[PDB]
């Protein structure tokens, strides 16, 4: 037997941080869930009971809190890069750090039209994420994502002209509901290290905002031929708007809303042109995935 | 043995309905989860295998869809009252109908400042609920609620002067974080029947909006002495603003955010006046409940 | 405005306790989730910012751990009664304590036929619960329950002879699948206080075991006319086997498994006598409730 | 822009199947959740609104049910291989099929010592899974797994001799609780196709049983130096017992149970040798991963 791969660390580290602007009195809050997994010359902790090579996960946790105290937690791409870099630089025998951050929404409350200085609402379960892979000698690989953005349109979605064989029962449609939970990931050009990441800091929030805006506008405006066609349009637009992105991945469930034939009851018409009441289906669900690159 | 209480029905009925304004082309969507449980002269289905008295739960489900097709689904207080009334009127032997409705948010999308005619976002997991108890000869009892409204304030919360004995370790504080998930219920005056409910229809959306506005404003603005003191202020204001409400119930978790002493690491100061990084606690949680009435 | 009802306390207190038999070396583990809510002369904490009457929920939490250290945590009926009694006796102004306990399964591992002295498995998500209401001057009300016992039978379930009207589409059946998640509660005779509870300690584990055995045997053996008929038989048997139980409540979802007509594909026969492949339905679900007493 | 990767299909397809032994009258039930995602010459569905190349996910769903009707659903490695092979053989332009199966437990009920012919219990939330990747011209890659096996031992776990620096607060221990949720995956030698899979059918159930037995025995019996050391022993034993496995992956959370110092209350001793009452921690959690191969 031989250890082919190993990684270990602390998952589900909840972190809150506040910034107090002293001039205005305005407070701003950040809340995240952090995972750090390490790789390196750790095989003997598995094979020979050698704990000497183990940076305890408890210590990893402490390190997350200390790093958040000493550094900005925004944008998450930066925080993750600082955190990951710390582990590979501090510990001679650690050669990679894998940092996952889930950012939770705390949106400033509006009270009688005024933004409140220190009151916030969890306005959506939509997340902003980063995956930061810091690898000794190969730089910093960042994947940024938004997830849990749930949307629905009541018309201007179609699905016809698909393959029909002896397995096919689905009727072609020129007018359906489309509902989905958007998971979109954009992968940055490899960064050489922390300096290069810092040099692009403004681009992170700007590109997240662009990706979200493009997603919503394209979903709302595309008279959709299919999930496939619509998601491709989103990706192509994001790529066109940020040079430093290599790939965009979308993963979209097709959350079906079924017509209910009520014609058995007093000839009630609730199908086709007359469809008003639908049965949202919990399961099963279509799952449509695309990775778009440049050429 | 004797059956002391019995109720039965269909739970977790997902319902979507669309309205198409033909003039403007504007579509509006409603999505809910419905539960209907019936009571009446049904004991023999339990005691003597007598299925003859059972309105099948499958039929209850059909009835929910048919009622949604034939009637407005908004406000939910009205829909629930219509639905409940149907069962007690249609079936001689059914004497009560218990209708629970969970309303899911589908907020119209804004695209370049314009509200989109047929595109929506699940903008929050916050729900609007009704419990409608239709009881033959005793009228219609409606409890309206909002739930899953998660809020946080970073200062202007205190907790001091509480009882201290040999079980007490908690330090008094004059500045803490307060975070909660608001569950608020307002119980209407008994309605004699469907006519009286209909006569008050506008009051339902208006009172829900008031309850939500009061909750958010009071939470944001109250320099809180405790959860108890703050929630009481919310309730008293709602009662003052709608004559037809008898009681308001609040149920508020105290979602603790703990200071992290980092003084063990290079004398880092992260407590009291210097507290920036906190550990949100998953469990356990305070749970504070209040029912406020008139006198 | 006037406070009509108030209660407050600590929820989601996770507790583990170990017993070490010194003779055998055998260890036994208990794990629970505890909620304690208090009532009493606490109105002024809500109405006048008077924290002086508040036993802090943090102190309630400490008290739960101290009580578990000083007393047996089994049977949960006893532990809950001790815990609740403490609050009403210690604090002059607290007049009721509501104690909910969820017991998690940690079943001893069998290794080559031998029970292992200190290794356990979470063998089921089935829970054993208690609700203990300790009310100053009115004694101790205990409701014991099992929940999350998920069962399925593949035949010997029927449902025919139900009411058929213009809302009915369900076909009568003489052979279906029946699947359910059993929630059963037995309510004890009021106890005068802690002495009387202690006097009946053996009855608690014995009655839980009886209730579970009766549930499983009756479910498995009853050629079921309906959920209603089967659940009544369970309840009547439990009542017959323990004098000190006043009522038994069952709450049973009907988790539907639908036939799939495949006759459209090469005349495949998968309905009625030929039904092999079924679609388990996530939602909606029947919900059947019964409370059985004595007469 | 150019599509670099694409896959699409149906997720969360719930499937139940019954076998009726006519001789004995014994029924046996299988329940699973199935995901099938396809790859192939499908780019134009994304880039040119060309639905002609799309095998509708609705058709994929139908195909899952038809395949379950026509073929054994056990072992899941076989079912997945049949299902995946169907898509690449039926459709000229589909070149890979990715089949994920989650098997749910339905354990036969024991009634007075007799196994019941048609009554089952969900005895654990532990799953048995397969991932079957059928790739045109490269054969069939099967990963088998067990997951959600939650275990706890109350002693004979240690953690000392780990790295100590200025980030370290964790005290070395020679006696702790160890609790984990076991996720173990074994990757089979590549199979050339369906014939070779069929030739090894007995090995699938046998190897799953071995992996589970080894996991439980090693966990229970190892006086653990660390999660790392213990999980390695499990993997090495599984590899030694089945020639046709290439790699074994374990992913183990370290579910912390914290000592509670009660010495502040009347000098109660509840730490070290006297630790009886512990606080199970929801989060954060260690996460320890290992892939073991041969050499
Ligand atoms: C109705 N429907 C399918 O049956 N397949 C799809 O995924 O769900 C698909 O491939 N494209 C769709 O947009 N709509 C679908
Ligand atoms: C810190 N804390 C308590 O210990 N009790 C309380 O509920 O959580 C309470 O009764 N009131 C509070 O607002 N804050 C609390
Ligand atoms: C098929 N079915 C119903 O439609 N109603 C029931 O609850 O689900 C009911 O009242 N009794 C049943 O056992 N079966 C049912
Ligand atoms: C106490 N503890 C750590 O702090 N790191 C570990 O993962 O949780 C680790 O690396 N090994 C352990 O078994 N125990 C741990």
Residue numbers in the entry:
A (entry chain AAA), B (entry chain AAA), C (entry chain AAA), D (entry chain AAA): 1 to 295
What does the paper behind this entry write?
We show here the versatility of this setup and methodology by performing structural studies at room temperature (RT) of three additional enzyme systems of biological relevance: (i) Klebsiella pneumoniae CTX-M-14 β-lactamase, a β-lactamase relevant to multi-antibiotic resistance mechanisms; (ii) Nectria haematococca xylanase GH11, a highly active xylanase suitable for industrial applications; and (iii) Aspergillus flavus urate oxidase (UOX) in the presence of the long-lived intermediate-like 5-per­oxy-9-methyl-isourate (5PMUA).
Instead, we purposefully crushed twelve large crystals (approximate volume of each crystal 0.13 mm3) using 1 mm-diameter glass beads to explore whether this rather coarse approach could be useful for SSX experiments, for example, when microcrystal optimization is problematic. UOX crystallizes in space group I222 with one monomer in the crystallographic atomic unit. As previously observed in the structure of the complex solved at cryo-temperature, 5PMUA binds at the interface between two protomers of the UOX tetrameric assembly in a cavity lined by K10*, I54*, A56*, T57*, D58*, F159, R176, L170, S226, V227, Q228, N254, H256, G286, I288 (the asterisk indicates residues belonging to a separate UOX chain) with the peroxide moiety sandwiched between the side chains of T57* and N254. The peroxide moiety displays pronounced pyramidalization at C5 accompanied by the strong distortion of its fused heterocycles. Overall, the present RT medium-resolution complex is virtually identical to that at 100 K and near-atomic resolution with an RMSD of 0.23 Å for all common main-chain atoms in the residue range (1–295) [Fig. 9(a)]. Overall, the quick ‘crush-and-collect’ approach employed here allowed the determination of the RT structure of the UOX-5PMUA complex and the visualization of the radiation-sensitive 5PMUA intermediate at medium resolution.
